[PDB]
Amino acid sequence: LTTRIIKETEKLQKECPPGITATPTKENPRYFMVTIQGPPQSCYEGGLFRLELFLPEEYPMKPPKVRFLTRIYHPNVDKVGRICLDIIKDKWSPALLINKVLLSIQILMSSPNPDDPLANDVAEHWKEDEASALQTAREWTRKYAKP
Amino acid sequence: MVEVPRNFRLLEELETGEKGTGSNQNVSVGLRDTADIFFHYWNGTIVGPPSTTFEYRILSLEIYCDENYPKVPPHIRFLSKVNLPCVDSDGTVNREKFHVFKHWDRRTTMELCLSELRKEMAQPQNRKLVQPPEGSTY
């Protein structure tokens, strides 16, 4: 529990971006349960999405680890919730904070990147027939992300 | 005089951090790389002081203690973007403008350097400098 982590924890409890919650576990204060509301007007609107985030030993040299738990139909999220997002991959800087990671995932839910280099079938659907993809995403939101 | 060798000075500072009770929670320093036994790089944190345009920002710094530390000052760079006179446009803490560095005393520790950068933010002259958006980096 470095000073940094303690101050970040406070900012996450008190000043989480609107639509987001993040709360450390009692057994493990480096391990956070996270929620993000499906963005209004998006295909995820109305849903409540649960994620888990962990600060590994080498944080902040290395980024937080973070995945969805709630199933979500999204070009940049795989079938076990792993997230293709540049800032928790190759565009991480030690100055960035958890707050920013979570905001970025919230933005990624409104603004998917189906042209991300690494091919997957959901991205391919988004490109082939965006309207159908969005429709499947709404169906998945109703099925899996009910508040 | 009796010069403390660099490696034993840095072991001293390592232990001060380790023995730290957790009281001072507005400045922090700690080893960057878990396996460097020669302690070249340190991570620094400053929490921007209250009633300033820096307030409560979690500001990150990198500290390099080269061959000649602490005979010459540590190299301190802000990773978080700041508007502060002693900080150059690449985030480097300027050796002629930061009072602690201009008149360098061996005895000054990395933790004191950070407390002293934090006071720089609270000064009447600097406490109103317009800052970049919170979270900005160089």
Author numbering:
A (entry chain AAA): 2 to 148
B (entry chain BBB): 1 to 138
Quote what the paper states about this structure:
We show that, amongst others, the E2 ubiquitin-conjugating enzyme UBC2 and the ubiquitin E2 variant UEV1 are essential for the promastigote to amastigote transition and subsequently characterise these proteins in biochemical and structural detail. We demonstrate that UBC2 and UEV1 form a heterodimer capable of carrying out ubiquitination and that the structural basis for this activity is conserved between Leishmania, Saccharomyces cerevisiae and humans. Therefore, L. mexicana UBC2 and UEV1 readily associate to form a heterodimeric UBC2-UEV1 complex. The UBC2-UEV1 heterodimer, like its S. cerevisiae and human orthologues, is able to form K63-linked ubiquitin chains in vitro, suggesting a role for non-degradative ubiquitin modifications in Leishmania differentiation.
Crystals, which appeared after two days from polyethylene glycol (PEG)-containing solutions, were sent for data collection at the Diamond Light Source, with the best crystal yielding a dataset extending to 1.7 Å spacing. Like its S. cerevisiae and human orthologues, UBC2 has a canonical E2 structure comprising a 4-stranded antiparallel β-sheet flanked by four α-helices. UEV1 exhibits a similar topology, but its polypeptide chain is shorter and the prominent pair of α-helices at the C-terminus of UBC2 (α3 and α4) are missing from UEV1. Superposing UBC2 with human UBE2N, UEV1 with human UBE2V2 or the UBC2-UEV1 and UBE2N-UBE2V2 heterodimers gives RMSDs of 0.82, 1.15 and 1.13 Å for 147, 135 and 271 equivalent atoms respectively, demonstrating a high level of structural conservation between these orthologues. The conserved active site residues, His75, Pro76, Asn77 and Cys85, reside on an extended segment of the polypeptide that connects strand β4 and helix α2 of UBC2, with the thiol group of Cys85 projecting out of the catalytic cleft. The interface between UBC2 and UEV1 involves the β2, β3 and β4 strands and the loops following β1, β3 and β4 of UBC2 and the N-terminus, α1 helix and loop following β1 of UEV1. The buried surface area of this interface is 1,466 Å2. The core of the interface contains a number of hydrophobic residues (Tyr32, Phe55, Leu70 and Val81 of UBC2 and Pro5, Phe8, Leu11, Leu14 and Phe39 of UEV1) that contribute strongly to the interaction. Hydrophobic residues are highly conserved at these positions, highlighting the importance of the associated hydrophobic interactions for complex formation. These hydrophobic interactions are complemented by a number of polar intermolecular interactions, mostly notably between the side chains of Glu53 of UBC2 and Asn7 of UEV1 and Arg68 of UBC2 and the main chain carbonyl oxygen of Ile37 of UEV1. Notably, a salt bridge is formed between Arg83 of UBC2 and Glu18 of UEV1.
